[PDB]
Short mmCIF file of C-alpha atoms and ligand atoms in Angstrom, two decimals:
data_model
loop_
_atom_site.label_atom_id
_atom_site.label_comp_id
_atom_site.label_asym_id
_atom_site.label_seq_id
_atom_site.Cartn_x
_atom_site.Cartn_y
_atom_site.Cartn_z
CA UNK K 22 -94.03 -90.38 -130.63
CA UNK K 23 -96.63 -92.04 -132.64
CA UNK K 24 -99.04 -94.46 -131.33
CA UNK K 25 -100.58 -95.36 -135.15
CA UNK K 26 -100.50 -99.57 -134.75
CA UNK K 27 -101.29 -99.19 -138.63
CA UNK K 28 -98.71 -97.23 -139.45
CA UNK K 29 -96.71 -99.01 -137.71
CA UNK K 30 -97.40 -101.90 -139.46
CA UNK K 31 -96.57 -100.49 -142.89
CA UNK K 32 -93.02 -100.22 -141.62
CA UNK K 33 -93.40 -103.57 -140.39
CA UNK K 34 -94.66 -105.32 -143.52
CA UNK K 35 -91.51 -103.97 -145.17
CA UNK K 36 -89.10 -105.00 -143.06
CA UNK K 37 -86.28 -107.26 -143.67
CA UNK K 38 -83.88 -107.01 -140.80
CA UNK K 39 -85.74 -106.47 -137.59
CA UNK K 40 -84.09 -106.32 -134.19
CA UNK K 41 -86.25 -107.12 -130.94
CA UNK K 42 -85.10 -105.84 -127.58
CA UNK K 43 -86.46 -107.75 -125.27
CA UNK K 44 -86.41 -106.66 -121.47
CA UNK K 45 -87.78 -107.73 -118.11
CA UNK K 46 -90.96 -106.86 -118.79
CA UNK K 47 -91.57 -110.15 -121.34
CA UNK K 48 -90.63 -112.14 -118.42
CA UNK K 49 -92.73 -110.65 -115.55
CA UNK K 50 -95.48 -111.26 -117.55
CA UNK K 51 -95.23 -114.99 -117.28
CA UNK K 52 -94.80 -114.70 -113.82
CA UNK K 53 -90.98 -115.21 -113.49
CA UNK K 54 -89.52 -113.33 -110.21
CA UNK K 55 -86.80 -111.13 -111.59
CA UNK K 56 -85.57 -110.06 -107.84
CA UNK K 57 -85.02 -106.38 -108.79
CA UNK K 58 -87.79 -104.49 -108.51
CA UNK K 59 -89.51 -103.18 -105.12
CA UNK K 60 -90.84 -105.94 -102.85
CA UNK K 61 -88.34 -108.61 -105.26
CA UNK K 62 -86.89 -110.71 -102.93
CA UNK K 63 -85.26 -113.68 -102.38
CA UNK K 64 -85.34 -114.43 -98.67
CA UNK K 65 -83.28 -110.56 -97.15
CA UNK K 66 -81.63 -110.19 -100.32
CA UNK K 67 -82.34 -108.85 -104.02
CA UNK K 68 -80.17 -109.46 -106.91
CA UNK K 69 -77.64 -106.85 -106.75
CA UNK K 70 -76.75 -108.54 -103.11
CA UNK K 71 -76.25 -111.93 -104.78
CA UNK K 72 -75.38 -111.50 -108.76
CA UNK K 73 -72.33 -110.22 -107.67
CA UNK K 74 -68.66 -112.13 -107.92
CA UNK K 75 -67.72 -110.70 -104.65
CA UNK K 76 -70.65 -112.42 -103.24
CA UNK K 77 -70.02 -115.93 -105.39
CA UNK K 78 -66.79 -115.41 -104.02
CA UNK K 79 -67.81 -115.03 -100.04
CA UNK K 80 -70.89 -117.50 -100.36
CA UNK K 81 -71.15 -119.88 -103.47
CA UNK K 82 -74.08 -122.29 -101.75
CA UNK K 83 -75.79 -119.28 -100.84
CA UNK K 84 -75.38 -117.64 -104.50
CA UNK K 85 -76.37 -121.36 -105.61
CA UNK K 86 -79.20 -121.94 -103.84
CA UNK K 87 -80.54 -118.43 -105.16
CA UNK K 88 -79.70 -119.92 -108.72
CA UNK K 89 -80.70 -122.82 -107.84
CA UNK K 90 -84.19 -121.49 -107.05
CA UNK K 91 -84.68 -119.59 -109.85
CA UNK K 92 -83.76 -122.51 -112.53
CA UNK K 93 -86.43 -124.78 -110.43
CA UNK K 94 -89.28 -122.31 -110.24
CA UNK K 95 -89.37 -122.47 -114.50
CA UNK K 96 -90.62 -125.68 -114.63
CA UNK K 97 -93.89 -123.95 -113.52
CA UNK K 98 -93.66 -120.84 -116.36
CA UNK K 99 -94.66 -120.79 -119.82
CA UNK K 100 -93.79 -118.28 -122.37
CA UNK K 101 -96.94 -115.30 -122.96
CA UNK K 102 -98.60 -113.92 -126.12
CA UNK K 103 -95.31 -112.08 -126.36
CA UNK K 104 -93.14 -114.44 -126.29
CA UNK K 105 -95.22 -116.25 -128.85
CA UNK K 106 -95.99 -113.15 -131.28
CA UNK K 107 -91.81 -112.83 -131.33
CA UNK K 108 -91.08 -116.57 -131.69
CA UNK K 109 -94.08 -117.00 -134.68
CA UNK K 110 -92.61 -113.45 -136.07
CA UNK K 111 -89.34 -114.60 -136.50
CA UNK K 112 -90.34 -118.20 -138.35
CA UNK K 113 -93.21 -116.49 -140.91
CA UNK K 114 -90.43 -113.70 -141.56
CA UNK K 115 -87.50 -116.58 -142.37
CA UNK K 116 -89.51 -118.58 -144.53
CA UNK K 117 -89.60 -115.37 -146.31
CA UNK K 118 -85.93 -114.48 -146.44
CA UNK K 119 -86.57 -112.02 -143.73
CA UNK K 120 -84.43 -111.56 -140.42
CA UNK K 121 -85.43 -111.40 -137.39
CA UNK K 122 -83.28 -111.40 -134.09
CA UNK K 123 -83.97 -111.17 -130.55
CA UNK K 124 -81.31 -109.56 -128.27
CA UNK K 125 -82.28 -110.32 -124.75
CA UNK K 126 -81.53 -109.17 -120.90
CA UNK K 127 -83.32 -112.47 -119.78
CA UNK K 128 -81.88 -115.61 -117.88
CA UNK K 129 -84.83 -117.61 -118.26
CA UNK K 130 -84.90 -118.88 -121.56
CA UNK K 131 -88.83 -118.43 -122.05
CA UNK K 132 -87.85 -117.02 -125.98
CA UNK K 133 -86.73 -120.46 -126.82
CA UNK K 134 -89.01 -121.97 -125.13
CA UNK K 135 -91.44 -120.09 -127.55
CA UNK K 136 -89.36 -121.47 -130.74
CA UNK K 137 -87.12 -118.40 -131.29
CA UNK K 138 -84.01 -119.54 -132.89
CA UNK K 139 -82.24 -116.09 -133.40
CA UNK K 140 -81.23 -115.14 -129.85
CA UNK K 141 -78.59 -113.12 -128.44
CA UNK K 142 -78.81 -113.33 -124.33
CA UNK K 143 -76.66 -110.63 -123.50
CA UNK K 144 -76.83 -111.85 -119.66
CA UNK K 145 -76.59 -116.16 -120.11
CA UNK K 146 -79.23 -118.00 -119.25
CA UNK K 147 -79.59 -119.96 -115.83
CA UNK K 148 -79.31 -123.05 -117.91
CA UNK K 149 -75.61 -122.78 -118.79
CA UNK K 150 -73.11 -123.49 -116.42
CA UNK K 151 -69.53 -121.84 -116.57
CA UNK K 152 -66.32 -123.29 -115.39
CA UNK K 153 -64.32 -121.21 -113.14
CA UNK K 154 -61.34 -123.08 -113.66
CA UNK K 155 -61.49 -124.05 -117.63
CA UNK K 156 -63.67 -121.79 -118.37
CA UNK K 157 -66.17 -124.17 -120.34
CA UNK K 158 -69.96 -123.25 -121.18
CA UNK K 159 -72.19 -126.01 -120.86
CA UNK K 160 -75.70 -126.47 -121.13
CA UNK K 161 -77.44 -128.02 -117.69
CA UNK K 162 -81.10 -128.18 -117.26
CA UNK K 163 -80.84 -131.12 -114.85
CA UNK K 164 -83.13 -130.63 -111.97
CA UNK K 165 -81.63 -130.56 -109.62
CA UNK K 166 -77.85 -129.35 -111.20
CA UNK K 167 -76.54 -131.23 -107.85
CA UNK K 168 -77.95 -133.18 -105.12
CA UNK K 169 -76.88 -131.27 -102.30
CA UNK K 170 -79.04 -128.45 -103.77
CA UNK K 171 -82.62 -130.68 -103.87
CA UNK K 172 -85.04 -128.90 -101.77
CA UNK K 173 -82.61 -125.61 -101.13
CA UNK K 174 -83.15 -122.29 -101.99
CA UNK K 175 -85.97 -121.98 -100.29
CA UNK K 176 -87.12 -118.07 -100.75
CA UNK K 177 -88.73 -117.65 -97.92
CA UNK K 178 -87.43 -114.70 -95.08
CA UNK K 179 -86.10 -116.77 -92.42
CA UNK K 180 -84.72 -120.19 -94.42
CA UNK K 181 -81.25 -120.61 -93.05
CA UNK K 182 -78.19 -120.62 -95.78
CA UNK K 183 -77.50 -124.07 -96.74
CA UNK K 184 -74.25 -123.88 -96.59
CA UNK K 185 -73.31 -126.99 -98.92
CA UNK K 186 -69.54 -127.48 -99.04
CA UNK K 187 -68.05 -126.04 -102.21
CA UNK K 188 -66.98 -129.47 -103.17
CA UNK K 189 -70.65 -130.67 -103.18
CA UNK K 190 -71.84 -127.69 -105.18
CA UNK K 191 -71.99 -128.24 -109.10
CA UNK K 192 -68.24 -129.18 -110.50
CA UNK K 193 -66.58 -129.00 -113.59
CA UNK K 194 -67.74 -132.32 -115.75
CA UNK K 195 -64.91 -131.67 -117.96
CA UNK K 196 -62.49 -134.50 -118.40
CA UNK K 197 -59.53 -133.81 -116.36
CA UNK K 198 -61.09 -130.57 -114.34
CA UNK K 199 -63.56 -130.85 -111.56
CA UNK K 200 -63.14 -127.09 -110.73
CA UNK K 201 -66.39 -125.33 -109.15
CA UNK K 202 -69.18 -124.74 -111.72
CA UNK K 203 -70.66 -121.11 -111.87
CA UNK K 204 -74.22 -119.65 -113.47
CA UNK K 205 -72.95 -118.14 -116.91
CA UNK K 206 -74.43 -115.38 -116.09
CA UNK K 207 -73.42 -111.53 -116.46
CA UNK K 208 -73.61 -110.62 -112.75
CA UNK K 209 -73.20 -107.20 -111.63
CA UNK K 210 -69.94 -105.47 -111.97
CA UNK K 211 -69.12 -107.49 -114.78
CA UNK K 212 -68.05 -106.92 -118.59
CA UNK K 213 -70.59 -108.52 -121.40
CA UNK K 214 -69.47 -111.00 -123.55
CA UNK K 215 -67.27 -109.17 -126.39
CA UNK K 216 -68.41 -111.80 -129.20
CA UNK K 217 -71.67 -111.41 -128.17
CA UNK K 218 -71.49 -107.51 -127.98
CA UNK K 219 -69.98 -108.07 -131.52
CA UNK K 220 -72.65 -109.57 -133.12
CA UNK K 221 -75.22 -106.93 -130.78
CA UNK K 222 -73.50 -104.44 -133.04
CA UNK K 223 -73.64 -105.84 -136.24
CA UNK K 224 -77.87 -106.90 -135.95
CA UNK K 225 -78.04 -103.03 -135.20
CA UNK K 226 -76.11 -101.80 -138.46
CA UNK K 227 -77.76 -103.84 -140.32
CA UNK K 228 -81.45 -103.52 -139.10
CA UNK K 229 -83.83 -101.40 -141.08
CA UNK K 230 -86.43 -101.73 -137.87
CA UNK K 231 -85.92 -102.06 -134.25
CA UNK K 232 -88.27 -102.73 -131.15
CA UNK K 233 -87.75 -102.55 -128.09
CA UNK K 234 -90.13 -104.05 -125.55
CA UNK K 235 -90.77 -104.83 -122.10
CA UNK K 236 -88.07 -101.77 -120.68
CA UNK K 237 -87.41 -98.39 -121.63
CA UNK K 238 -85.64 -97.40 -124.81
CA UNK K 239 -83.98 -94.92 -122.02
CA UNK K 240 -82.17 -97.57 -119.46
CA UNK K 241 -79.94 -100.08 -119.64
CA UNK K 242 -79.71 -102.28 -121.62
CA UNK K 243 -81.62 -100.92 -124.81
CA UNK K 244 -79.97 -97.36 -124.11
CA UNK K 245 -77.21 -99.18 -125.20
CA UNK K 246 -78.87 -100.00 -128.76
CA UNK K 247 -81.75 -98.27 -129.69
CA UNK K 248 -80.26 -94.37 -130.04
CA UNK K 249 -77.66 -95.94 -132.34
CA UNK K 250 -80.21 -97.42 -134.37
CA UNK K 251 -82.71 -94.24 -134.39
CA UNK K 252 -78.99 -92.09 -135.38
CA UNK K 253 -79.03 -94.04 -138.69
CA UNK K 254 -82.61 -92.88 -139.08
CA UNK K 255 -84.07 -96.20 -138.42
CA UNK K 256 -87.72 -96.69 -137.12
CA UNK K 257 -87.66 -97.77 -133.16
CA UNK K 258 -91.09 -98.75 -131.65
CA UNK K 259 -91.57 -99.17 -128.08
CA UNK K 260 -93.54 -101.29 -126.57
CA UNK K 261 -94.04 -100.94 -122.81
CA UNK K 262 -96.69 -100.39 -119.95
CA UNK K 263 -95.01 -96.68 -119.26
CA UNK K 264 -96.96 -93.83 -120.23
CA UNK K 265 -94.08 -92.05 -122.03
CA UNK K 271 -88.66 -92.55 -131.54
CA UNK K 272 -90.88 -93.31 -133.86
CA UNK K 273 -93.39 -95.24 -131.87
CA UNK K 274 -94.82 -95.82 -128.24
CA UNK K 275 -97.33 -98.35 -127.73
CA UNK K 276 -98.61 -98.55 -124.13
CA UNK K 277 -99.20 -101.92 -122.48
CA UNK K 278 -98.45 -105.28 -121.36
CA UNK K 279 -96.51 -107.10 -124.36
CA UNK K 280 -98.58 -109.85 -124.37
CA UNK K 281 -101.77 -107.57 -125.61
CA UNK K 282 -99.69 -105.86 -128.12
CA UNK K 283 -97.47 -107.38 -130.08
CA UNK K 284 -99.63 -110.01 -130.99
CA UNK K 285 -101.47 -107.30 -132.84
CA UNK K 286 -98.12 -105.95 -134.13
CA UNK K 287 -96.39 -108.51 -135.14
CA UNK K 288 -99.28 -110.54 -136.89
ZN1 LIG A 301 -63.73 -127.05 -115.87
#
């Protein structure tokens, strides 16, 4: 796999339908805890204990408060170079009647933070709320999304649940439902959106370049995209901090595709 940046580019300067998949790399670089990893987590539990709706189900204040956490602790991020490169890609490339899309693992919402319009966030975002009575998506970036929940979710080992009666968790603002508000979030065990997987599918037939950065082209979820891509013969350009498609460039995000995408 080719590690030519100027070759590269020569693909890239003739592109008019580029797909970016964006992984969890993008975000640990501006710091956000993703509570996956080793050493990630959130008091004794990572997010496979808590993204799950068995465990909404058993605990919602403590799934909350984890949630609740991780929608407060952004007011302290900012989007990277990367971030940046991808948003300023995407609006130089439009005003030339050039696509580009973003198709994104990430809750946090640091790609439209950047400016990027053309998102696809395959997992929701921590600032939309899901009714699980109606059903209803909602933006909510109030801070906090209840009172009961100021000053929870506490991360540190040893902060007691605080076990907030489900009425006094976030409710359904919906005229005429008041049912029990969840993240809309994909949490483990748990189909993707199809309308979203629909339009996944048609930004990667119609692509004529794809990258994929911050994860492996190998893992979920770009192992989902990127072979299907390469299969049409389409250039797919990795950009990662592995040391091993068409291209591999080693390193943080931020220090690359800057360079890449300029
Ligand atoms: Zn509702």
């Amino acid at each position: 796999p080719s590690s030519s940046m100027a070759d590269f580019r020569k693909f890239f300067a003739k592109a008019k339908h580029i797909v970016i998949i964006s992984g969890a790399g993008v975000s640990a670089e501006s710091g956000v805890p993703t509570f996956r990893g080793a050493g990630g987590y959130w008091r004794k539990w990572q997010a496979q204990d808590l993204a799950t709706p068995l465990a909404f189900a058993h605990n919602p204040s403590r799934v909350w408060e984890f949630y609740h956490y991780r929608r407060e602790v952004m007011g302290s991020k900012e989007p990277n170079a990367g971030h940046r490169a991808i948003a300023e890609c995407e609006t130089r490339l439009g005003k030339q009647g050039r696509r580009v899309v973003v198709i994104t693992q990430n809750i946090d919402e640091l790609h439209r933070k950047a400016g990027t319009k053309n998102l696809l966030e395959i997992h929701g975002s921590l600032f939309k709320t899901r009714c699980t009575s109606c059903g209803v998506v909602a933006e909510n970036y109030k801070s906090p999304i209840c009172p009961a929940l100021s000053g929870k979710g506490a991360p540190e080992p040893g902060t007691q649940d605080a076990s907030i009666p489900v009425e006094k968790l976030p409710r359904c603002e919906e005229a005429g439902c008041g049912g029990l508000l969840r993240p809309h979030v994909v949490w483990f065990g748990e189909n993707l959106d199809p309308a979203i997987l629909e339009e996944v599918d048609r930004e990667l037939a119609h692509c004529d370049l794809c990258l994929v950065v911050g994860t492996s082209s190998v893992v979920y979820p770009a192992a989902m995209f990127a072979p299907q891509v390469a299969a049409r013969g389409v250039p797919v350009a990795e950009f990662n901090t592995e040391t091993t498609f068409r291209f591999h460039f080693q390193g943080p995000c931020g220090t690359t595709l800057p360079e890449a995408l300029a």
